[PDB]
């Protein structure tokens, strides 16, 4: 069970400032919601030895902290204490509707980034809602109004391979075997390939990038909290994005 690796105190010490009034998602993300959701995904934080389960959770909270960070360079307790500050895409996001007969856009509904993985677009809310048996296509606001659902979308993303792009789960648990194409593209198992899976088109293969360095900093802080050392191949600066 995942609760033997991650306690309420480890969750709270990682997500130290999420409940500050400056965070729009303050009061949303609970340890209970996380454990309820985690238990629905067989293998999630229960694959491998203790250090491998710790590493998976460090990596999962690292990446999701980046997706939702409200941190700045000089924030209280540093930038890597301000994960899980947002539950919806910032700026003025549009409806993120790309029509699908399989996963049709609901009238008046918007599919902008919500929750810990910032799940976006009607196609993804529909694929996800099918997998977790929730009406995300008709009510995408559930991902920001129900914290158990919010965590389910992020773990769903984390556990789901995309053809030649592995699950974050496989990579974080040392179960990803890189293809010859992967090797030629510099995609060596590590946290960097996880950044590549999540947003490599934007962030990877272009040299030093502050968003990548941010993802690493969260993961480094959380490895410390779990009492493990970070893995190798932390960045994707010299990785070709997954096409
Ligand atoms: C609202 C919040 O607490 N945090 C920050 C904001 O103040 C910050 O300066 C900027 C990037 O550093 O984006 C937000 O996420």
From TrEMBL:
Residue positions binding N-acetyl-D-glucosamine: 69-70
**Which cysteine pairs are joined by S-S bonds?**
23-85, 97-105, 204-236
Q: What class of enzyme is it?
A: hydrolase
An example Gene Ontology molecular-function term:
endochitinase activity
Q: Which UniProt keywords apply?
A: Carbohydrate metabolism, Chitin degradation, Chitin-binding, Disulfide bond, Glycosidase, Hydrolase, Polysaccharide degradation, Signal
Kindly list the biological process annotations in GO that this record carries: cell wall macromolecule catabolic process; chitin catabolic process; defense response to fungus; polysaccharide catabolic process; positive regulation of mitotic nuclear division
What reaction does this catalyse? Random endo-hydrolysis of N-acetyl-beta-D-glucosaminide (1->4)-beta-linkages in chitin and chitodextrins
Q: Where is the active site?
A: 67 (proton donor)
EC number(s) of the enzyme?
3.2.1.14
Q: What protein family does this chain belong to?
A: Belongs to the glycosyl hydrolase 19 family. Chitinase class I subfamily.
Annotated protein name in UniProt: chitinase
| Organism expressing this protein natively | Drosera adelae
The shown range, given as first to last of full length, is 79 to 321 of 321
């Amino acid at each position: 069970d995942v609760s033997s690796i991650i306690t309420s105190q480890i969750f709270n010490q990682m997500l130290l400032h999420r409940n500050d009034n400056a965070c729009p998602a303050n009061g949303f993300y609970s340890y209970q919601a996380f454990i309820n959701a985690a238990r629905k995904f067989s293998g999630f934080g229960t694959t491998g030895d203790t250090n491998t389960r710790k590493n998976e959770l460090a990596a999962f909270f690292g990446q999701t902290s980046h997706e939702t960070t409200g941190g700045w360079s000089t924030a209280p307790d540093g930038p890597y204490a301000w994960g899980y500050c947002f539950k919806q895409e910032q700026g003025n996001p549009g409806d993120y509707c790309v029509p699908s007969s399989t996963y049709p856009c609901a009238p008046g509904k918007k599919y902008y980034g919500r929750g810990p993985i910032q799940i976006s677009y009607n196609y993804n809310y529909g694929l996800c809602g099918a997998a977790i048996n929730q009406p995300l296509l008709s009510n995408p606001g559930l991902v920001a109004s129900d914290a158990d659902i919010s965590f389910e979308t992020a773990i769903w993303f984390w556990m789901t391979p995309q053809g030649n792009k592995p699950s974050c789960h496989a990579v974080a648990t040392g179960q990803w075997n890189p293809s010859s194409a992967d090797q030629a593209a510099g995609r060596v198992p590590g946290y960097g390939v996880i950044t590549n899976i999540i947003n490599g088109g934007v962030e990877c293969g272009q040299g030093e990038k502050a968003e990548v360095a941010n993802r690493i900093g969260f993961y480094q802080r959380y490895c410390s909290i779990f009492g493990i050392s970070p893995g190798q191949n932390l960045d994707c600066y010299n990785q070709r994005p997954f096409s």
